CSV table of C-alpha atoms and ligand atoms in Angstrom, one decimal:
chain,number,residue,atom,x,y,z
Q,1,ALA,CA,-20.5,3.7,23.9
Q,2,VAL,CA,-18.2,2.3,21.2
Q,3,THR,CA,-15.4,0.0,22.2
Q,4,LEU,CA,-12.4,-0.2,19.8
Q,5,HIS,CA,-9.5,-2.6,20.0
Q,6,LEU,CA,-6.3,-1.9,18.1
Q,7,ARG,CA,-4.9,-5.2,16.8
Q,8,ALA,CA,-1.0,-5.6,16.7
Q,9,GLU,CA,0.1,-6.0,13.1
Q,10,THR,CA,1.4,-9.4,12.2
Q,11,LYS,CA,2.4,-8.7,8.5
Q,12,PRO,CA,6.3,-9.0,8.5
Q,13,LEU,CA,8.0,-5.6,8.9
Q,14,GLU,CA,4.7,-3.7,9.2
Q,15,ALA,CA,5.5,-0.7,11.5
Q,16,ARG,CA,2.4,1.5,11.0
Q,17,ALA,CA,-0.6,1.6,13.2
Q,18,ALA,CA,-4.3,2.2,12.3
Q,19,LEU,CA,-4.8,4.5,15.2
Q,20,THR,CA,-2.0,6.7,16.5
Q,21,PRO,CA,-1.7,7.7,20.2
Q,22,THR,CA,-3.3,11.2,19.2
Q,23,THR,CA,-6.1,9.5,17.5
Q,24,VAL,CA,-6.7,7.3,20.6
Q,25,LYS,CA,-6.6,10.4,22.9
Q,26,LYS,CA,-9.2,12.2,20.7
Q,27,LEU,CA,-11.5,9.2,20.6
Q,28,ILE,CA,-11.4,8.8,24.4
Q,29,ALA,CA,-12.5,12.4,24.8
Q,30,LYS,CA,-15.4,11.6,22.5
Q,31,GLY,CA,-16.4,8.8,24.9
Q,32,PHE,CA,-14.9,5.7,23.2
Q,33,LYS,CA,-13.4,2.9,25.1
Q,34,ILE,CA,-10.1,2.0,23.4
Q,35,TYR,CA,-7.9,-1.1,23.9
Q,36,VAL,CA,-4.4,-1.2,22.3
Q,37,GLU,CA,-2.4,-4.4,21.9
Q,38,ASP,CA,1.2,-4.0,22.9
Q,39,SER,CA,2.8,-4.4,19.5
Q,40,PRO,CA,6.5,-5.5,19.1
Q,41,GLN,CA,6.6,-4.1,15.4
Q,42,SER,CA,4.8,-0.8,15.9
Q,43,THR,CA,6.9,2.4,15.3
Q,44,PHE,CA,4.9,3.9,18.2
Q,45,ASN,CA,6.1,3.2,21.9
Q,46,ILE,CA,3.4,1.5,24.0
Q,47,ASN,CA,3.8,4.3,26.6
Q,48,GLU,CA,2.5,6.9,24.1
Q,49,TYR,CA,-0.7,4.9,24.0
Q,50,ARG,CA,-0.6,4.5,27.8
Q,51,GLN,CA,-0.4,8.3,28.2
Q,52,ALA,CA,-3.2,8.7,25.6
Q,53,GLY,CA,-5.6,6.7,27.9
Q,54,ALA,CA,-5.6,3.4,26.1
Q,55,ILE,CA,-6.1,0.2,28.1
Q,56,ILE,CA,-3.1,-1.9,27.2
Q,57,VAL,CA,-3.5,-5.6,26.4
Q,58,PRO,CA,-1.4,-8.3,24.9
Q,59,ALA,CA,-0.7,-9.0,21.3
Q,60,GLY,CA,-3.5,-11.0,19.7
Q,61,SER,CA,-5.9,-10.7,22.6
Q,62,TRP,CA,-8.5,-9.5,20.0
Q,63,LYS,CA,-9.2,-13.2,19.2
Q,64,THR,CA,-10.7,-13.7,22.6
Q,65,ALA,CA,-12.2,-10.2,23.2
Q,66,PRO,CA,-15.9,-9.7,23.8
Q,67,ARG,CA,-18.0,-9.8,20.5
Q,68,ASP,CA,-19.0,-6.1,20.8
Q,69,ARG,CA,-15.5,-4.8,20.4
Q,70,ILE,CA,-14.7,-3.4,16.9
Q,71,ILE,CA,-11.3,-4.8,16.0
Q,72,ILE,CA,-9.2,-2.3,14.1
Q,73,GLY,CA,-5.9,-3.1,12.2
Q,74,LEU,CA,-4.2,-2.1,8.9
Q,75,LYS,CA,-3.0,-5.2,7.2
Q,76,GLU,CA,-4.1,-8.7,6.3
Q,77,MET,CA,-4.7,-11.5,8.8
Q,78,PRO,CA,-2.3,-14.3,8.6
Q,79,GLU,CA,-3.2,-16.9,5.9
Q,80,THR,CA,-2.6,-19.5,8.7
Q,81,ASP,CA,-5.5,-18.0,10.9
Q,82,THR,CA,-8.5,-20.2,9.9
Q,83,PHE,CA,-11.0,-19.7,12.6
Q,84,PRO,CA,-14.3,-17.8,12.1
Q,85,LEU,CA,-14.2,-14.0,12.3
Q,86,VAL,CA,-17.1,-12.9,14.6
Q,87,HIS,CA,-16.3,-9.3,15.3
Q,88,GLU,CA,-16.8,-6.2,13.2
Q,89,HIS,CA,-13.4,-5.6,11.7
Q,90,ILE,CA,-11.9,-2.4,10.2
Q,91,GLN,CA,-8.8,-3.2,8.1
Q,92,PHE,CA,-7.5,-3.4,4.5
Q,93,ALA,CA,-8.4,-6.9,3.4
Q,94,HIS,CA,-7.6,-6.6,-0.4
Q,95,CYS,CA,-10.4,-9.1,-1.4
Q,96,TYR,CA,-12.9,-7.2,-3.4
Q,97,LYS,CA,-11.0,-7.3,-6.8
Q,98,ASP,CA,-10.6,-11.1,-7.1
Q,99,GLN,CA,-7.0,-11.1,-5.7
Q,100,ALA,CA,-5.8,-14.7,-5.3
Q,101,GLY,CA,-7.5,-16.3,-2.3
Q,102,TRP,CA,-10.2,-13.5,-1.9
Q,103,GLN,CA,-12.9,-16.1,-1.2
Q,104,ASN,CA,-11.0,-17.5,1.8
Q,105,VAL,CA,-10.7,-14.1,3.3
Q,106,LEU,CA,-14.5,-13.5,3.1
Q,107,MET,CA,-15.4,-17.1,4.2
Q,108,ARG,CA,-13.9,-16.5,7.7
Q,109,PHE,CA,-16.3,-13.6,8.1
Q,110,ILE,CA,-19.2,-15.6,6.6
Q,111,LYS,CA,-18.6,-18.5,9.1
Q,112,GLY,CA,-18.3,-16.2,12.1
Q,113,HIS,CA,-21.1,-13.8,11.1
Q,114,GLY,CA,-18.6,-11.0,11.3
Q,115,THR,CA,-18.5,-7.8,9.3
Q,116,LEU,CA,-15.6,-6.3,7.3
Q,117,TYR,CA,-15.5,-2.6,6.9
Q,118,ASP,CA,-12.6,-2.3,4.5
Q,119,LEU,CA,-10.5,0.9,4.9
Q,120,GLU,CA,-10.0,1.2,1.1
Q,121,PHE,CA,-13.8,1.5,0.4
Q,122,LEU,CA,-14.6,4.0,3.0
Q,123,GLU,CA,-15.8,7.0,0.9
Q,124,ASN,CA,-17.5,10.3,1.3
Q,125,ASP,CA,-20.8,11.3,-0.2
Q,126,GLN,CA,-19.0,12.2,-3.5
Q,127,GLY,CA,-17.5,8.8,-4.0
Q,128,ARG,CA,-14.0,9.9,-2.8
Q,129,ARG,CA,-11.9,7.9,-0.3
Q,130,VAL,CA,-11.8,9.3,3.2
Q,131,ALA,CA,-8.2,8.1,4.0
Q,132,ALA,CA,-5.4,6.8,1.9
Q,133,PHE,CA,-1.7,6.0,2.1
Q,134,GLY,CA,-1.1,6.4,-1.6
Q,135,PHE,CA,1.1,9.5,-1.5
Q,136,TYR,CA,3.6,7.9,0.9
Q,137,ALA,CA,3.6,4.8,-1.2
Q,138,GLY,CA,4.5,6.6,-4.5
Q,139,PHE,CA,7.0,8.6,-2.6
Q,140,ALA,CA,8.7,5.5,-1.0
Q,141,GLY,CA,8.3,3.6,-4.2
Q,142,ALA,CA,10.0,6.2,-6.3
Q,143,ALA,CA,12.8,6.4,-3.8
Q,144,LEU,CA,13.6,2.7,-4.0
Q,145,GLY,CA,13.3,2.8,-7.8
Q,146,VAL,CA,15.8,5.6,-8.1
Q,147,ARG,CA,18.1,3.8,-5.6
Q,148,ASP,CA,17.8,0.6,-7.7
Q,149,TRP,CA,18.5,2.4,-11.0
Q,150,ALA,CA,21.6,4.0,-9.4
Q,151,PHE,CA,22.8,0.7,-7.9
Q,152,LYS,CA,22.7,-0.9,-11.4
Q,153,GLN,CA,25.2,1.9,-12.5
Q,154,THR,CA,27.9,1.4,-9.8
Q,155,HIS,CA,27.7,-2.2,-8.7
Q,156,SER,CA,28.3,-5.6,-10.1
Q,157,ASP,CA,25.3,-7.3,-11.7
Q,158,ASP,CA,26.0,-10.1,-9.2
Q,159,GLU,CA,24.7,-7.8,-6.4
Q,160,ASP,CA,21.1,-6.8,-5.6
Q,161,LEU,CA,19.8,-3.7,-3.9
Q,162,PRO,CA,20.3,-4.5,-0.2
Q,163,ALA,CA,17.7,-4.7,2.6
Q,164,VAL,CA,15.9,-1.5,3.5
Q,165,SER,CA,14.8,-0.4,7.0
Q,166,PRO,CA,12.2,2.3,7.9
Q,167,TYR,CA,13.3,5.9,8.1
Q,168,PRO,CA,12.7,8.3,10.9
Q,169,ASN,CA,11.7,11.0,8.4
Q,170,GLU,CA,11.5,12.0,4.8
Q,171,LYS,CA,14.6,14.1,4.9
Q,172,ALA,CA,16.8,11.0,5.8
Q,173,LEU,CA,15.2,9.0,3.0
Q,174,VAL,CA,15.7,11.7,0.4
Q,175,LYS,CA,19.3,12.2,1.6
Q,176,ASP,CA,20.1,8.4,0.9
Q,177,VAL,CA,18.5,8.4,-2.4
Q,178,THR,CA,20.2,11.7,-3.5
Q,179,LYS,CA,23.6,10.3,-2.5
Q,180,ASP,CA,23.2,7.1,-4.6
Q,181,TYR,CA,21.8,9.1,-7.4
Q,182,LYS,CA,24.5,11.8,-7.6
Q,183,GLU,CA,27.1,9.0,-7.3
Q,184,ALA,CA,25.7,7.2,-10.4
Q,185,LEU,CA,25.5,10.5,-12.4
Q,186,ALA,CA,29.1,11.3,-11.3
Q,187,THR,CA,30.3,8.1,-13.0
Q,188,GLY,CA,28.8,9.0,-16.4
Q,189,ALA,CA,25.3,7.4,-16.2
Q,190,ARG,CA,22.8,9.4,-18.3
Q,191,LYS,CA,20.1,11.2,-16.3
Q,192,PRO,CA,17.2,8.7,-16.2
Q,193,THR,CA,13.8,9.2,-17.8
Q,194,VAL,CA,11.0,8.1,-15.5
Q,195,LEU,CA,7.7,7.0,-16.9
Q,196,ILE,CA,4.8,7.3,-14.4
Q,197,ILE,CA,1.4,5.8,-15.3
Q,198,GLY,CA,-1.4,6.9,-12.9
Q,199,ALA,CA,0.5,10.2,-12.5
Q,200,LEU,CA,-2.5,12.3,-11.5
Q,201,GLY,CA,-3.5,10.1,-8.4
Q,202,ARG,CA,-2.3,10.0,-4.8
Q,203,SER,CA,0.7,7.7,-5.4
Q,204,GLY,CA,1.5,9.3,-8.7
Q,205,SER,CA,1.8,12.6,-6.9
Q,206,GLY,CA,4.0,11.2,-4.2
Q,207,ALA,CA,6.3,9.7,-6.8
Q,208,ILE,CA,6.6,13.1,-8.7
Q,209,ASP,CA,7.2,14.7,-5.4
Q,210,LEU,CA,10.1,12.4,-4.6
Q,211,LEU,CA,11.6,12.7,-8.1
Q,212,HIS,CA,11.6,16.5,-7.7
Q,213,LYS,CA,13.1,16.4,-4.3
Q,214,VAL,CA,16.0,14.2,-5.5
Q,215,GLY,CA,16.7,16.5,-8.5
Q,216,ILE,CA,15.3,14.6,-11.5
Q,217,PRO,CA,14.1,17.4,-14.0
Q,218,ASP,CA,10.5,17.7,-14.9
Q,219,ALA,CA,11.5,17.0,-18.6
Q,220,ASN,CA,12.8,13.6,-17.6
Q,221,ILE,CA,9.4,12.6,-16.1
Q,222,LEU,CA,6.6,11.3,-18.4
Q,223,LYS,CA,3.3,11.8,-16.6
Q,224,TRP,CA,0.8,9.5,-18.0
Q,225,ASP,CA,-2.8,8.9,-16.9
Q,226,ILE,CA,-6.1,7.8,-18.6
Q,227,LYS,CA,-5.7,10.1,-21.6
Q,228,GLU,CA,-2.2,8.8,-22.6
Q,229,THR,CA,-3.3,5.1,-22.2
Q,230,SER,CA,-6.7,5.0,-23.9
Q,231,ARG,CA,-5.1,3.6,-27.1
Q,232,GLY,CA,-4.4,0.4,-25.0
Q,233,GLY,CA,-1.2,-1.5,-24.3
Q,234,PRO,CA,1.4,-2.9,-24.5
Q,235,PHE,CA,3.5,0.3,-24.8
Q,236,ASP,CA,6.9,1.1,-26.4
Q,237,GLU,CA,7.6,3.9,-24.0
Q,238,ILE,CA,8.0,1.5,-21.1
Q,239,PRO,CA,11.1,-0.4,-22.5
Q,240,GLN,CA,12.5,2.9,-23.6
Q,241,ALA,CA,12.2,4.6,-20.1
Q,242,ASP,CA,14.9,4.1,-17.5
Q,243,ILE,CA,12.5,3.7,-14.6
Q,244,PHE,CA,8.8,2.8,-14.9
Q,245,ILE,CA,6.5,3.4,-11.9
Q,246,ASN,CA,3.0,1.9,-12.0
Q,247,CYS,CA,0.6,4.1,-9.9
Q,248,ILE,CA,-2.7,3.1,-11.4
Q,249,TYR,CA,-5.9,2.1,-9.7
Q,250,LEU,CA,-6.7,-1.1,-11.5
Q,251,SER,CA,-10.6,-1.2,-11.6
Q,252,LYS,CA,-11.6,-2.3,-15.2
Q,253,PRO,CA,-9.9,-5.2,-17.2
Q,254,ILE,CA,-7.3,-3.6,-19.4
Q,255,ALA,CA,-4.6,-4.5,-21.9
Q,256,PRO,CA,-1.2,-5.1,-20.2
Q,257,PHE,CA,1.3,-2.2,-20.3
Q,258,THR,CA,4.2,-4.4,-21.5
Q,259,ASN,CA,5.2,-8.0,-21.8
Q,260,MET,CA,8.2,-10.4,-21.9
Q,261,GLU,CA,8.4,-10.2,-25.7
Q,262,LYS,CA,8.8,-6.3,-25.7
Q,263,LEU,CA,11.3,-6.5,-22.9
Q,264,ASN,CA,13.6,-9.2,-24.4
Q,265,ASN,CA,15.4,-6.7,-26.6
Q,266,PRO,CA,19.1,-5.6,-26.8
Q,267,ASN,CA,18.2,-1.9,-27.1
Q,268,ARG,CA,16.0,-1.8,-24.0
Q,269,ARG,CA,16.9,1.0,-21.6
Q,270,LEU,CA,14.5,0.0,-18.8
Q,271,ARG,CA,16.3,-1.0,-15.7
Q,272,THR,CA,13.7,-0.8,-12.7
Q,273,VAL,CA,10.0,-1.3,-12.6
Q,274,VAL,CA,8.4,0.1,-9.5
Q,275,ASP,CA,5.0,-1.6,-9.2
Q,276,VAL,CA,3.4,0.7,-6.7
Q,277,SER,CA,-0.2,-0.4,-7.6
Q,278,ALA,CA,1.0,-3.9,-6.9
Q,279,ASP,CA,-1.9,-5.9,-8.3
Q,280,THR,CA,0.5,-8.8,-8.3
Q,281,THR,CA,-2.1,-11.5,-7.5
Q,282,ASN,CA,-4.8,-9.9,-9.7
Q,283,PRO,CA,-5.7,-11.9,-12.9
Q,284,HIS,CA,-5.7,-8.6,-14.8
Q,285,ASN,CA,-2.4,-7.4,-13.5
Q,286,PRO,CA,-1.2,-5.2,-16.4
Q,287,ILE,CA,2.4,-6.1,-15.5
Q,288,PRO,CA,2.7,-9.9,-15.9
Q,289,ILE,CA,6.5,-9.8,-16.0
Q,290,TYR,CA,7.0,-10.9,-12.4
Q,291,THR,CA,5.2,-13.0,-9.7
Q,292,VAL,CA,7.1,-12.3,-6.5
Q,293,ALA,CA,5.9,-9.8,-4.0
Q,294,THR,CA,9.2,-8.2,-2.8
Q,295,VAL,CA,9.7,-7.2,0.8
Q,296,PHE,CA,11.8,-4.5,2.5
Q,297,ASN,CA,14.5,-7.1,3.5
Q,298,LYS,CA,14.7,-8.2,-0.2
Q,299,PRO,CA,13.2,-5.3,-2.2
Q,300,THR,CA,13.9,-6.2,-5.8
Q,301,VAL,CA,13.3,-9.3,-8.0
Q,302,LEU,CA,15.2,-10.0,-11.3
Q,303,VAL,CA,12.9,-10.1,-14.3
Q,304,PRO,CA,14.7,-12.9,-16.3
Q,305,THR,CA,15.3,-11.3,-19.7
Q,306,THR,CA,17.0,-12.9,-22.7
Q,307,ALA,CA,18.3,-9.6,-24.2
Q,308,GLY,CA,19.1,-6.1,-22.8
Q,309,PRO,CA,20.6,-5.1,-19.4
Q,310,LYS,CA,19.6,-6.4,-15.9
Q,311,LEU,CA,16.0,-5.4,-15.1
Q,312,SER,CA,14.4,-5.7,-11.7
Q,313,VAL,CA,10.9,-5.3,-10.2
Q,314,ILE,CA,10.0,-3.7,-6.8
Q,315,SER,CA,6.6,-4.9,-5.5
Q,316,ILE,CA,6.5,-4.2,-1.8
Q,317,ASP,CA,2.8,-4.0,-0.9
Q,318,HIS,CA,3.2,-1.7,2.1
Q,319,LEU,CA,5.6,1.0,1.0
Q,320,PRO,CA,4.2,3.6,3.4
Q,321,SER,CA,5.8,1.6,6.2
Q,322,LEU,CA,9.1,3.0,5.0
Q,323,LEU,CA,8.0,6.2,6.8
Q,324,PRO,CA,5.7,4.6,9.4
Q,325,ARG,CA,5.2,7.3,11.9
Q,326,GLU,CA,4.1,10.2,9.7
Q,327,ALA,CA,2.3,7.9,7.3
Q,328,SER,CA,0.2,6.6,10.3
Q,329,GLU,CA,-0.4,10.2,11.6
Q,330,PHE,CA,-1.5,11.3,8.2
Q,331,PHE,CA,-3.8,8.4,7.6
Q,332,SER,CA,-5.3,8.4,11.1
Q,333,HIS,CA,-6.1,12.1,11.0
Q,334,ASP,CA,-8.0,11.7,7.7
Q,335,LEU,CA,-9.8,8.6,9.1
Q,336,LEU,CA,-10.9,10.2,12.4
Q,337,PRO,CA,-14.1,12.0,11.2
Q,338,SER,CA,-15.4,8.6,10.0
Q,339,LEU,CA,-14.4,6.8,13.2
Q,340,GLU,CA,-16.4,9.5,15.2
Q,341,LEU,CA,-19.5,8.3,13.4
Q,342,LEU,CA,-19.1,4.6,14.5
Q,343,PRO,CA,-21.8,5.0,17.3
Q,344,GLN,CA,-24.2,5.7,14.4
Q,345,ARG,CA,-22.6,3.1,12.0
Q,346,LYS,CA,-26.0,1.5,11.4
Q,347,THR,CA,-27.2,4.6,9.6
Q,348,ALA,CA,-24.0,6.7,8.9
Q,349,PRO,CA,-23.6,6.4,5.1
Q,350,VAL,CA,-19.8,6.0,5.2
Q,351,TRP,CA,-20.2,2.8,7.3
Q,352,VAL,CA,-23.5,1.6,5.7
Q,353,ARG,CA,-22.1,1.8,2.2
Q,354,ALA,CA,-19.1,-0.3,3.3
Q,355,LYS,CA,-21.3,-2.9,5.1
Q,356,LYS,CA,-23.6,-3.2,2.0
Q,357,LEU,CA,-20.5,-3.6,-0.3
Q,358,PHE,CA,-19.2,-6.4,2.1
Q,359,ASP,CA,-22.6,-8.2,1.9
Q,360,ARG,CA,-22.6,-8.0,-1.9
Q,361,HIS,CA,-19.1,-9.5,-2.1
Q,362,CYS,CA,-20.0,-12.2,0.5
Q,363,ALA,CA,-22.9,-13.1,-1.8
Q,364,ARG,CA,-20.4,-14.0,-4.7
Q,365,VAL,CA,-18.6,-16.6,-2.5
Q,366,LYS,CA,-19.2,-20.4,-3.2
Q,367,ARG,CA,-20.6,-22.2,-0.1
W,1,NAI,N1,2.5,-0.7,-2.6
W,1,NAI,C1,1.9,-0.1,-1.6
W,1,NAI,O1,2.4,0.0,-0.4
W,1,NAI,C2,0.7,0.8,-1.9
W,1,NAI,C3,-0.1,0.5,-3.0
W,1,NAI,N2,-1.2,1.3,-3.3
W,1,NAI,C4,-2.0,1.0,-4.5
W,1,NAI,O2,-2.0,2.1,-5.5
W,1,NAI,C5,-3.2,2.0,-6.3
W,1,NAI,C6,-3.6,3.4,-6.6
W,1,NAI,O3,-3.7,4.1,-5.3
W,1,NAI,P1,-4.0,5.7,-5.3
W,1,NAI,O4,-2.8,6.4,-5.9
W,1,NAI,O5,-4.6,6.1,-4.0
W,1,NAI,O6,-5.2,5.8,-6.4
W,1,NAI,P2,-5.7,7.1,-7.1
W,1,NAI,O7,-7.1,6.7,-7.4
W,1,NAI,O8,-5.4,8.4,-6.4
W,1,NAI,O9,-4.9,7.3,-8.5
W,1,NAI,C7,-5.0,6.3,-9.5
W,1,NAI,C8,-4.7,6.9,-10.8
W,1,NAI,O10,-4.6,5.9,-11.9
W,1,NAI,C9,-5.3,6.5,-13.0
W,1,NAI,N3,-5.7,5.3,-13.9
W,1,NAI,C10,-6.6,4.4,-13.6
W,1,NAI,N4,-6.5,3.4,-14.6
W,1,NAI,C11,-5.6,3.8,-15.5
W,1,NAI,C12,-5.1,3.3,-16.7
W,1,NAI,N5,-5.6,2.1,-17.2
W,1,NAI,N6,-4.1,3.9,-17.3
W,1,NAI,C13,-3.6,5.1,-16.9
W,1,NAI,N7,-4.0,5.6,-15.7
W,1,NAI,C14,-5.0,5.0,-15.0
W,1,NAI,C15,-6.4,7.3,-12.5
W,1,NAI,O11,-6.9,8.3,-13.3
W,1,NAI,C16,-5.8,7.9,-11.2
W,1,NAI,O12,-5.2,9.2,-11.5
W,1,NAI,C17,-4.3,1.4,-5.4
W,1,NAI,O13,-5.0,0.3,-6.0
W,1,NAI,C18,-3.5,0.9,-4.1
W,1,NAI,O14,-3.9,-0.4,-3.7
W,1,NAI,C19,-1.5,2.3,-2.5
W,1,NAI,C20,-0.8,2.6,-1.3
W,1,NAI,C21,0.3,1.8,-1.0
W,2,SHR,N1,-3.6,-2.7,-5.4
W,2,SHR,C1,-3.6,-4.0,-4.6
W,2,SHR,C2,-3.0,-3.8,-3.2
W,2,SHR,C3,-1.7,-3.0,-3.1
W,2,SHR,C4,-1.1,-3.0,-1.7
W,2,SHR,C5,-1.9,-1.9,-0.8
W,2,SHR,N2,-1.3,-1.7,0.5
W,2,SHR,C6,-1.5,-0.3,1.0
W,2,SHR,C7,-2.9,0.2,1.0
W,2,SHR,C8,-3.1,1.7,1.5
W,2,SHR,C9,-4.2,2.5,0.8
W,2,SHR,O1,-4.8,2.0,-0.3
W,2,SHR,O2,-4.5,3.6,1.3
W,2,SHR,C10,-0.9,-0.1,2.4
W,2,SHR,O3,-0.5,1.0,2.6
W,2,SHR,O4,-0.7,-1.1,3.2
W,2,SHR,C11,-5.0,-4.5,-4.4
W,2,SHR,O5,-6.0,-3.8,-4.8
W,2,SHR,O6,-5.2,-5.6,-3.8
């Protein structure tokens, strides 16, 4: 049989779960044994998992679980966990693109003889991702960006966009954003132009979807992707946009989309940068204008400019947790076919590809 163990998330404010109660109920009917840690931050009630058939165990009991259990979780391990990782782990580890500290992430697996099957690199035969939160991120990102832009029209510069909390549904999020937005227009603010780079992807789509729902007109949205950026940055259309939303998948080293020089300019219209891609700790980050990773409880950081109006960056790295329950159901449904193959993970290509990718990255690590 396969035994799975759903780890309680420890990333602050992370409310999503990698397996939902439905997903657990379906896996049990397929013969899996499933443990679920009682999580204080999860949007799901522990009783939904009880009724699904999960064995309920305490938060962080994965650490002492039998070595045959596959530990599944969404987000990073705490930096302060330094002991060897001995299980097979399914999670997002963000350590295959030379993010700051990537060697330390992998070294725990190397010392424990564990295996990382990274959620981002689970792909079908045709090179496409099997499960992805991108749409919910571009959506949530675009919502906070429009909210920030609107705030800057109706509030003192002294003030920053206040803490956000997760929403019970998209309708309620769109209602908040639409209020702030109409309120700013009512006072004479010009309808914003929004520049989206990576517009054709998952998060680009979610961001266009939000902008439509809130009532920004198609003409006001510049939808850029690889065509439009082949000339290479930095670009002039960024400082002249009202809102810039970065939705690229950064894979190759590229010329930065803008810089401090271009932004220090009295005639800059740009008020809000939504860095959805959020390759903040990447050495090739094509948005080197900030260094802070913002969080729901403090969602914007000031980009200190020497000319032009107050500009802020949003760089929350788990935007989909603004809408935790449906984001989780969406992702787990799309993940399920792969998880059903875990009994055969030694031969199933989706799993094997991911194991071989892990071994090649571990080979790059200094010993
Ligand atoms: N902040 C958060 O909570 C989240 C962040 N993300 C991040 O978003 C990034 C993209 O995710 P997805 O939308 O699923 O990827 P995706 O692969 O669906 O779309 C990426 C788009 O960027 C375009 N692109 C790539 N390089 C470009 C360039 N140099 N110039 C212009 N366009 C370029 C591609 O053609 C593609 O259409 C990921 O790296 C992911 O880590 C995703 C989910 C949540
Ligand atoms: N682009 C960065 C990471 C951005 C943060 C991603 N967090 C997302 C991932 C979801 C997905 O890709 O499906 C999240 O939803 O927690 C990197 O490559 O290191």
